[PDB]
């Protein structure tokens, strides 16, 4: 009926990422199996328009059905584990196996990489994703 679940992704040594525009890092897969999901981030954006941003997407990796509908929310955890800078889908999106949905302009690199803003404690970026399938 309703299935809600989450995944915390810690990306270590974030400041050292050498990904150029268009290059991707994928997380490990996770589930609530049947369905398998992963997160995917472009540290230097998906394209020229988003070069100044991290792009963050949810990918349906494996799926027994033709399609699944899911709402999602991504946030960044601070040193206290508190969610900050969240973006949420305003409705459910249609995933098929191999389809992603997310935010091309999730967070400004010039904000995230300034350590005084407190989102890279010990140079780790911690993302938190919550997914609901109805």
């Amino acid at each position: 009926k309703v299935v809600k679940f989450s995944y915390m992704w810690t990306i270590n040594n974030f400041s050292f990422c050498r990904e150029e525009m268009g290059e991707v890092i994928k997380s490990s897969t996770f589930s609530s199996d049947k369905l398998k999901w992963c997160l995917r981030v472009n540290p230097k954006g998906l394209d020229e328009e988003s070069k100044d941003y991290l792009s963050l997407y949810l990918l349906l990796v494996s799926c027994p059905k033709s399609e699944v509908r899911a709402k999602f929310k991504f946030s960044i955890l601070n040193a206290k584990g508190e969610e900050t800078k969240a973006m949420e889908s305003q409705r459910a999106y249609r995933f098929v196996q191999g389809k992603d949905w997310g935010f091309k302009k999730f967070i400004r690199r010039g904000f995230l990489l300034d350590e005084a803003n407190g989102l890279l404690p010990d140079d780790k970026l911690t993302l938190f994703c919550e997914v609901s399938v109805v």
């Binding site: 998906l46 305003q90 949905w101 935010f103 302009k105 999730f106």
Partner: peptide, 8 residues
């Protein structure tokens, strides 16, 4: 910045 899109 808050628009949902897909890479495909």
């Amino acid at each position: 910045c808050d628009e949902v899109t897909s890479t495909t």
